Amino acid sequence: ALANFIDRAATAASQVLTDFHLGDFKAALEKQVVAVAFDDQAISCAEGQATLDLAVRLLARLYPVLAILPLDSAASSQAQALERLAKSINRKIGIRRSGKSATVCLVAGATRPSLRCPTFFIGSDGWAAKLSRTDPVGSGSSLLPYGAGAASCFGAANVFRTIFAAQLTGAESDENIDLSLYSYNKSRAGDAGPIDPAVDLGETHLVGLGAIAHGALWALARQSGLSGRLHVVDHEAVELSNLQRYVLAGQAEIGMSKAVLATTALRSTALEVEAHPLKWAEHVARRGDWIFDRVGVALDTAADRVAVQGALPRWIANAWTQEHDLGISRHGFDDGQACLCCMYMPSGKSKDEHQLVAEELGIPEAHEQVKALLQTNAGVPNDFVVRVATAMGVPFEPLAPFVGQPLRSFYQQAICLVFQLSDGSRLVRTVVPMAFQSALAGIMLAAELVKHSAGFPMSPTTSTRVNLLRPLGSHLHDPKAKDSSGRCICSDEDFISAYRRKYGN
Amino acid sequence: ALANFIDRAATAASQVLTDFHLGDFKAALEKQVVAVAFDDQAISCAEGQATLDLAVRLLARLYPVLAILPLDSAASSQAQALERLAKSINRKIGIRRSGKSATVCLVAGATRPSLRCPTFFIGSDGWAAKLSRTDPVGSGSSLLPYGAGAASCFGAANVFRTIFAAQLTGAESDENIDLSLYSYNKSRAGDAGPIDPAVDLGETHLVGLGAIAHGALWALARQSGLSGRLHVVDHEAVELSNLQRYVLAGQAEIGMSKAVLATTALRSTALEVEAHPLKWAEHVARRGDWIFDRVGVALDTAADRVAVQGALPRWIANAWTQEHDLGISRHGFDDGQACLCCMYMPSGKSKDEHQLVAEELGIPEAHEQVKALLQTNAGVPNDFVVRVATAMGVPFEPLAPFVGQPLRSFYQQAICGGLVFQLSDGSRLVRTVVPMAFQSALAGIMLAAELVKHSAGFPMSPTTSTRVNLLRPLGSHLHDPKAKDSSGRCICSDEDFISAYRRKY
Amino acid sequence: ELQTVDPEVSRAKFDREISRFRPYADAYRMQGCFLIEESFPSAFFIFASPKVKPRVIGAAIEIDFTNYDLRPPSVVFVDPFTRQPIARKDFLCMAGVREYHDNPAHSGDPWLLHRGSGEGCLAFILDKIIKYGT
Amino acid sequence: PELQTVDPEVSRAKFDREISRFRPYADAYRMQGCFLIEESFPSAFFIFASPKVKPRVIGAAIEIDFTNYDLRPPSVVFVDPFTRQPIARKDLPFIQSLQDSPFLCMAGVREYHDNPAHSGDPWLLHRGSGEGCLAFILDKIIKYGT
Amino acid sequence: IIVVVNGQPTQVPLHVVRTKALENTQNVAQPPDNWEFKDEAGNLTVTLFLSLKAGVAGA
Numbered sequence A: 001a002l003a004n005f006i007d008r009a010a011t012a013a014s015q016v017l018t019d020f021h022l023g024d025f026k027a028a029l030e031k032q033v034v035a036v037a038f039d040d041q042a043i044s045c046a047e048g049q050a051t052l053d054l055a056v057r058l059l060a061r062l063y064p065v066l067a068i069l070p071l072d073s074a075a076s077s078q079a080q081a082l083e084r085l086a087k088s089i090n091r092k093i094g095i096r097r098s099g100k101s102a103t104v105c106l107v108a109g110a111t112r113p114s115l116r117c118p119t120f121f122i123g124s125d126g127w128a129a130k131l132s133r134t135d136p137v138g139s140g141s142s143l144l145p146y147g148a149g150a151a152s153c154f155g156a157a158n159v160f161r162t163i164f165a166a167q168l169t170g171a172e173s174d175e176n177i178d179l180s181l182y183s184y185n186k187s188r189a190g191d192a193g194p195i196d197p198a199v200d201l202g203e204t205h206l207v208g209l210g211a212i213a214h215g216a217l218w219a220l221a222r223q224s225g226l227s228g229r230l231h232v233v234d235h236e237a238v239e240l241s242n243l244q245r246y247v248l249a250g251q252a253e254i255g256m257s258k259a260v261l262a263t264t265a266l267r268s269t270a271l272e273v274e275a276h277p278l279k280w281a282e283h284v285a286r287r288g289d290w291i292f293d294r295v296g297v298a299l300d301t302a303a304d305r306v307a308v309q310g311a312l313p314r315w316i317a318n319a320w321t322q323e324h325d326l327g328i329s330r331h332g333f334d335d336g337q338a339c340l341c342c343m344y345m346p347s348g349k350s351k352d353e354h355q356l357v358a359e360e361l362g363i364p365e366a367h368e369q370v371k372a373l374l375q376t377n378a379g380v381p382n383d384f385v386v387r388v389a390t391a392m393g394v395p396f397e398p399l400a401p402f403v404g405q406p407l408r409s410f411y412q413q414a415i416c417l418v419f420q421l422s423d424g425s426r427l428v429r430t431v432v433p434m435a436f437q438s439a440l441a442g443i444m445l446a447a448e449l450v451k452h453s454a455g456f457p458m459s460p461t462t463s464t465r466v467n468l469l470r471p472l473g474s475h476l477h478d479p480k481a482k483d484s485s486g487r488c489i490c491s492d493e494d495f496i497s498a499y500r501r502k503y504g505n
Numbered sequence B: 001a002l003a004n005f006i007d008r009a010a011t012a013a014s015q016v017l018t019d020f021h022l023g024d025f026k027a028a029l030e031k032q033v034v035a036v037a038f039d040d041q042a043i044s045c046a047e048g049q050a051t052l053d054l055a056v057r058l059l060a061r062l063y064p065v066l067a068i069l070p071l072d073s074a075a076s077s078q079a080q081a082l083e084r085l086a087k088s089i090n091r092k093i094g095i096r097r098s099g100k101s102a103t104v105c106l107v108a109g110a111t112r113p114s115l116r117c118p119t120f121f122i123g124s125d126g127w128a129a130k131l132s133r134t135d136p137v138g139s140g141s142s143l144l145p146y147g148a149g150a151a152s153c154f155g156a157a158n159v160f161r162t163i164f165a166a167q168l169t170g171a172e173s174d175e176n177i178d179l180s181l182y183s184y185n186k187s188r189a190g191d192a193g194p195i196d197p198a199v200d201l202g203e204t205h206l207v208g209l210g211a212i213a214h215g216a217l218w219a220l221a222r223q224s225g226l227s228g229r230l231h232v233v234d235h236e237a238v239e240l241s242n243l244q245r246y247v248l249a250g251q252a253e254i255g256m257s258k259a260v261l262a263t264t265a266l267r268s269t270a271l272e273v274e275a276h277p278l279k280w281a282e283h284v285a286r287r288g289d290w291i292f293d294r295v296g297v298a299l300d301t302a303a304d305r306v307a308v309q310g311a312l313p314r315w316i317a318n319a320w321t322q323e324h325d326l327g328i329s330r331h332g333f334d335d336g337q338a339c340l341c342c343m344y345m346p347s348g349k350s351k352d353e354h355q356l357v358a359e360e361l362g363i364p365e366a367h368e369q370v371k372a373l374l375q376t377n378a379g380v381p382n383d384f385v386v387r388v389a390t391a392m393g394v395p396f397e398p399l400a401p402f403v404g405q406p407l408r409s410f411y412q413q414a415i416c417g418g419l420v421f422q423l424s425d426g427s428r429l430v431r432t433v434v435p436m437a438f439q440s441a442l443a444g445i446m447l448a449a450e451l452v453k454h455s456a457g458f459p460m461s462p463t464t465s466t467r468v469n470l471l472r473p474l475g476s477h478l479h480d481p482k483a484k485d486s487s488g489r490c491i492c493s494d495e496d497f498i499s500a501y502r503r504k505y
Numbered sequence C: 001e002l003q004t005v006d007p008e009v010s011r012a013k014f015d016r017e018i019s020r021f022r023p024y025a026d027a028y029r030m031q032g033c034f035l036i037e038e039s040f041p042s043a044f045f046i047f048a049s050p051k052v053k054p055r056v057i058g059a060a061i062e063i064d065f066t067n068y069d070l071r072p073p074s075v076v077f078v079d080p081f082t083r084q085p086i087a088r089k090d091f092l093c094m095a096g097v098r099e100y101h102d103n104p105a106h107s108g109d110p111w112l113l114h115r116g117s118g119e120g121c122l123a124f125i126l127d128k129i130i131k132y133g134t
Numbered sequence D: 001p002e003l004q005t006v007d008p009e010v011s012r013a014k015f016d017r018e019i020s021r022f023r024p025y026a027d028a029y030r031m032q033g034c035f036l037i038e039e040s041f042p043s044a045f046f047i048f049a050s051p052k053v054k055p056r057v058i059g060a061a062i063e064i065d066f067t068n069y070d071l072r073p074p075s076v077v078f079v080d081p082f083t084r085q086p087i088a089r090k091d092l093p094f095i096q097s098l099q100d101s102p103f104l105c106m107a108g109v110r111e112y113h114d115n116p117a118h119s120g121d122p123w124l125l126h127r128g129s130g131e132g133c134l135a136f137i138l139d140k141i142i143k144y145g146t
Numbered sequence E: 001i002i003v004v005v006n007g008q009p010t011q012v013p014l015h016v017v018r019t020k021a022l023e024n025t026q027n028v029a030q031p032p033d034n035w036e037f038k039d040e041a042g043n044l045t046v047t048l049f050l051s052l053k054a055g056v057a058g059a
């Protein structure tokens, strides 16, 4: 019952777990039974259903055995649907209808499952996400998804930190969470956030339609009263390994245009969705109008996000999943605050690609031969691939077919593979976040676009960060000064004029 | 008593007389006593004084002996001044105080001198120039000098055509002239034309200050009450030879700037005189303002006159002397009439300088060698200056100083300055046209008449140009029509030139 | 590369780079550098050693200012008559040039460390070509 | 020298118009080796290079002067590409001593019409025909060098 | 036909009129090419004008 995409989930784990070993890891998963329990309070409201929906979507992307536990006869209808959701993500997933074997349980609603395994009550009330290790928290009656969905991400994170407690440090599970996704402070009885289906996105652009965007699209599609025109922009297609992180991708979405998927995700909103199977540059070029009223960035590299700022939209919400945190940043250009280019201004020189690849090949001092084999695109000799294989700690045989091929070929296959030949000791360089990190970052992104287009008072700091591999922070807000180098385009009078020319002030 | 500049006067006569020989011609002059006779009527008024002034100015530039004949005692003072004028032009000139030896005679005033020689009564009444062969015609009371001065010119021409009659064809003496310089028709008892001398010339440009300009200056200085700003433009200095033609130059003006001369000659008018001792092009470039309200042109070459029109003055008067004809043409540019460039549009290909130069020097077959020497402007080898003297029939020795100098120098000093002309007893004729003083003076009078009439606002001439042949009896019809160039190649057809004109005016 | 910066920005920056070259055109001509064509986003130059007799076009380039100056300019050697890219048998490894920063071997020297310094502007590029090539 | 005596409004409109008439063709002129380097009334400065010769050699550089255009035809002076100083025919890689500056022996050109040996072919016989416009001069030079 | 030859009139193909006009006014000294036959408007019983070209000498 491990997923066909499990190696990608193992690539992710290997980046957060100490003393990772692929074989142990997969065995550790097979000994688990992760329980989702729920009662009539949860299945009867929109918040509880949302929380269940996302929780199953997260857990089915990692755990080979789930127990789906309706706690009364009312919850039996939702149960069948949850089993069907879990199987749509991993057709061979294991489904238990009993908790006798649970290693960890998540509970929505008001009823206690009465199990001997660690148990987390999750839930919500409007903007507030709730988790408790000792008592049910229940699910509210609003039509808001943000608190309910964020609670699932906190649910799944605490599941992961509990199963893998022995391979993490400073990683205690949470005892209580009462976090407002409206304010990102502890939820106050008076200090609640407005709840209204009266929200128009105007003309909004969502750039990047991958994992983080999937969390955002999950939320927007549960946002009642959403009106407006939304552009979704991505040129890529869903790959099998994306089902490790992309909460709206199941087996049936493999191979499909990410732009076509984002469209159908929103079919039940009142949004007029325009889907563009293009990169941002081609979108910008085909519009010929550089009026961007509102842009949500859900991309994977600095340069791509910096390019979005170059176009000078009125306002950007930027979303990221990095190694030690996920988060959201907010940028007007002409407001005194940091700009998206600020967020990635380089501070110094770094290692060149021929050098970083030389470390990943266990040949740190062959940087000159890696640069030459990359420029000359010549075949890797036999004595090179024996050196690399020995430096990599694997047998030479899996890497023998590469003898005579470009080094770019060797690195694009064995390295992008050797992780499995080394039982997880050789880590890949590219960060693969966990599904629950991507989903929460996307929920925050949907949160920001909706709040900003509903005109709420905007955030006091540029960015908000969460680290789901530790107990939730008590101060999620992160300030960020405008770059003071002079070298950031938000310092440039030509850029400032072109922004005012479009938006005034 | 022949003048020190007599060879230049002989040059001029050599171009109008048949069977010319230089010894013969000077001998002919030496057998003459040309008498100017005058009474109280002539000397008591400005028209009388002006006629006498110019008659003497013209006759002293050619004839070696004059008789100055006051006919009553009031005319005595004028007689002494007239003698001093003659001598200031030719200090070796002869003055007779007796009429018995006159061979021809000009008379101003009302009294007959009753001499045994051809006698021509000259005078004027305002715009009218008057000459009779039989009765005194008198001097009017106006303060205009145009009729009075034109009368002298006709007087001097008839003196010349009487003395040299046998070397002229169709050159009878005039019996009667009564010509209005206002209309250039026979004067009428009604239309006397306006004689008020108080007029303002506006801001006028006189371009070229040679012979023609001396006639104009002579007139502008003798119109009492005339106001105006006169710009006078010429870069050259008076040379000895010029006294053959320049009615306001005497021995004392040899070497004087022509612009300074013209300034001094106007010092007693109320004209605001600005002297520009520069070429037109340098004047135009320093001025940096292409508004020229009124330009009088008194130049020597087609190119120089056309260059003036290129500046696009509002109105031009152009004056010339040629072999058998002098005159004035008038040009607005945007008036449906011929512009000054129309006057000199070329009618077809011609011979090049190398050929015409080669022909003059009696070597029409060294064209190729003369072409090289006019381009290199190299020194004429000894063997070349030898050939030329032989083919021309003169000694080598006077020309030896030109050996080694530029050919242009050799040519324009030896040939155009008349050195080979003297050496050949006038048989080797100069190709440079040299007009008679009485033609130069009349052309300039007519030019100052046009500028004055134009600036008083009189309706302008029915035809483009007005012509006079002083080597024949005055014509019955002096008006000369000229049609606009219709080739398409004159600038008065150019829409850019037309636009530049309308912008200014 | 496609223009994605607001073109009112890049056009303004390119036009100023050109305005600033014009007062120096005579000086550059002396060194053999001739602006041939100029029209956003490209500026076409031709080069000739002033001391090489006979006078020989040693190089022509196209300089691209697409997305200037967030992205630094591309410098391409082209044939002076056809404007087509040429092979070495007839890129400048230098910061301020987009071919250099986009070379993975120089991923450690990012352009935003240099932006605004004087590297990557037109005079900087013209002066480097003049000094080395001659 | 020749000083601007024609109303400069006239000669500057005509110049400006010759440059305007050149601009749409500049690519095709480049294909023949013809490069407009600098234009500033009264002067138009070009470089020329054989597209058909390898290595590419600057074979000619002209200053074209349009003072008093088009009452006076324009002056064509061969100059050095970098100094912009006249050159002698010895240093020049219808053209007429080797130490003397070459000129274009042709109706439409000031060094022709002012040459004494062609005084008999005055410019005003040719004005308004095409001879002496910028394209007429450019055509001749492009065709001398190949 | 009235031909004004150098201001002097005389009563008379077209070179036939100029030839008799030049013979009547004794102005046959100058080649017939130097003369320009024009009409009352100046175009290169009626009155025609057999005059010369404008002049260059003046200084």
Ligand SMILES: [Zn+2]
Binding pocket: A338, A339, A340, A341, A342, A343, A482, A483, A488, A489, A490, A491
């Ligand atoms: Zn910034």
Ligand SMILES: [Zn+2]
Binding pocket: B338, B339, B340, B341, B342, B343, B484, B485, B490, B491, B492, B493
């Ligand atoms: Zn005309």
